[PDB]
Structure 1
């Protein structure tokens, strides 16, 4: 699977966004854009996440 680690907290701006906290491990599901990817959190919730806020895991 493709996983990333949150480098900073992200509160989410649009309703499609996936809010997260620094340290969270997220799984990448799709990359419809270069800097915005769809990911899933440890609870199974899905949403868009900003690439600059994460590092590869």
Structure 2
């Protein structure tokens, strides 16, 4: 019962802690320290922060 999101826009990543991704990517949600910034993990296991408005709740 993992929580995923689908990237709506390409995010190159602004900060070193940010998780860069591309439009259509599936990311697993690990943490929610903020309303608009969540800690996610991509398909390859790389972790980092992502902007919520750039993704949609998968399923």
TM-score, structure 1 normalization:
0.99
Deviation >2 Å, runs of 4+? none
Partner SS state of residue 4, structure 1? strand
Cα deviation per residue 1:21-55 (whole Å; 9 max; x = unaligned)?
00000000000011000000000000000000000
Distance 1:32 1:15 in 2: 17
Question: How many residues are treated as equivalent by the alignment?
Answer: 57
Task: Output the aligned Cα RMSD.
Answer: 0.3
Q: For structure 2, list consecutive stretches of 5 or more residues without a partner in the other structure.
A: none
TM-score, structure 2 normalization:
0.95
Q: For structure 1, list consecutive stretches of 5 or more residues without a partner in the other structure.
A: none
